[PDB]
């Protein structure tokens, strides 16, 4: 299913992020993708997206987890919404849990593989 | 013939008019029944009625003067996606109104009645 395909791509994404492989993460995006991080300007293109994720790693963001909630397929696009969790150091240096939510526009390449095309997220309160 | 991008522009005009009229029902009416909104620092909001409540809450907090700028629209049959920017006046940490700006992505869907409606609506802030 396209939902299963996106879940597979997300498994690879998480593995690369948690292995501290910023190039690996960026490779899951289209070369002309864009990311929309909270409190930062829009980030365009795979190389700048690598720098974004490297920055996350450098700030101690770790143990990323993604849960796909729903996917709608539409031709060469698929629309995914989901939740995330992660850990990041507190002022105390102690790792604090954080969660949030996202929407991704995925695009299907000529080689048949789904890749991230627009990636936007923000934070949720603890529950 | 009217294009998807034209229909989306007319819908966005409807949206901003309703918001700035403090008409939360009017704003929520632009969403699909099974839409979801993704407000920063709040839980995901699912369904039109709850989306109304979300916007009513923004209004009750005093958030005002909504301006939207569409930067890209791509169509895909009975779906489309839009990215853009917003600006508004919102109470700051001291409760005084200040300029706030940010970016958004909307996944749009064409309903059975031909009407383009928001299906996923997510946004966040730009840096100062």
Give how many domains chain A has, as a whole number: 1
> CB of B36 within 8 A of CB of B56?
no
DSSP B70: E
Interface test mutation site (partner B, options A34, A74, A100, max chain B beta carbons within 10 A): A74
Structure determined by? X-ray
Q: Which of A38, A79, A105 has its CB closest to that of B124? A: A38
Q: What was the resolution (in A) of this experimentally determined structure?
A: 1.5
Which H/E stretch holds residue A8?
helix A2-18
**Closest C-alpha to A83, from A117, A126, A35:** A126
Give all strands (DSSP E) within chain A, no chain letters: 29-36, 43-44, 62-74, 77-89, 95-108, 114-124
**Closest C-alpha to B118, from B41, B54, B43, B22:** B54
What CATH number does the domain containing B1 carry? 3.10.450.50
Measured distance CA(B24)–CA(B21) in Å, rounded: 9
**Residue B43, number of CB atoms within 10 A of its CB:** 14
Which structural domain range is residue B63 located in?
Answer: 1-128
Torsion angles phi and psi, residue A43, rounded to 5 = -115, 120
Pairing, β B31-38 against β B64-76: unpaired
Asked if B36's CB is within 8 angstroms of A38's CB, the reply is: no
Is residue A98 within 8 angstroms of chain B, CB to CB? no
Instruction: Kindly state the tokens that stand for B31.
Output: 């969403």
Measured distance CA(A19)–CA(A3) in Å, rounded: 24
Measured distance CA(A11)–CA(A101) in Å, rounded: 17
DSSP B126: P
B90: Cα within 13 Å, side-chain hemisphere: 13
**Closest C-alpha to B24, from B54, B66, B56, B64:** B56
Is residue B81 within 8 angstroms of chain A, CB to CB? yes
């Amino acid at each position: 299913s396209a939902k299963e395909a996106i879940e597979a791509a997300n498994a690879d994404f998480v593995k690369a992020y948690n292995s501290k492989d910023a190039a690996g993460v960026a490779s899951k995006y289209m070369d002309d993708a864009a990311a929309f991080p909270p409190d930062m300007a829009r980030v365009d293109g795979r190389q700048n997206i690598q720098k974004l994720w490297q920055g996350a790693m450098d700030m101690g963001i770790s143990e990323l987890k993604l849960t796909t909630l729903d996917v709608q397929e539409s031709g060469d696009f698929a629309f995914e919404s989901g939740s995330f969790s992660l850990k990041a150091p507190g002022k105390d240096s102690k790792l604090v849990d954080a969660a949030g939510k996202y929407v991704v526009v995925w695009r299907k390449g000529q080689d048949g593989g789904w890749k991230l095309y627009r990636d936007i997220w923000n934070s949720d309160p603890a529950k």
